[PDB]
Design a protein around this ligand. Structure first.
Ligand SMILES: CCCCCCCCOCCOCCOCCOCCO
Ligand SMILES: CCCCCCCCOCCOCCOCCOCCO
Lengths: 25, 24, 26, 25, 26
C-alpha cells in the first residue's frame, strides 16, 4: 500500500525533525 | 490514512516553527 | 476532503522553509 | 487535481531543502 | 501514478533531512 509507505516516511521525517530540534537546542 | 497524514503534517509544522524560533 | 488540508499544511511548510532560508542568508 | 498540487508542493519542499543543505554546506 | 511521485519525493526529503543531520553532527 502506497499510503502506508507515505505514513511511514512522514513518521521518519517527524523523527528526523525531532533530532534536528534536539541538536539545535 | 488521511488522518495520519494530517496529524503528522501538523507535528511537522510545529517542529518547523520551533526550528524557526531557534534560528531567530 | 482532507486533500485541501494536506495542501494547506504543505503550503505552510513551504512558507516555513522560505523563512528558514531567509534566516540562514541573513 | 489535489494530487498534482500535493506533488508540486513536495517538489518545492525538496528544492527548498536542497537550498538549505547548500547554505549549511 | 501520483502516489509513486509522492513516495519518491518523500524519500528524497528523508535523504535531505539525513544530510542535514549529518551536517549538524559534523
Ligand atoms: C530552488 C533553489 C535551488 C536549490 C539549490 C541548489 C543549488 C544551490 O547552489 C546555488 C549556487 O549559488 C551559489 C551560492 O553562493 C554561495 C553560497 O553562499 C552565498 C549565500 O550568502
Ligand atoms: C533530490 C536530491 C536528493 C539527494 C540529496 C542527497 C545529498 C546530496 O546533496 C548534497 C548537496 O550539497 C551540495 C554540494 O555539497 C557541498 C559542496 O561544497 C562543500 C565544500 O566544497
Amino acid at each position: 500500500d502506497s499510503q502506508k509507505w507515505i505514513v511511514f516516511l512522514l513518521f521518519l521525517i517527524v523523527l528526523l525533525l525531532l533530532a534536528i530540534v534536539f541538536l539545535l537546542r
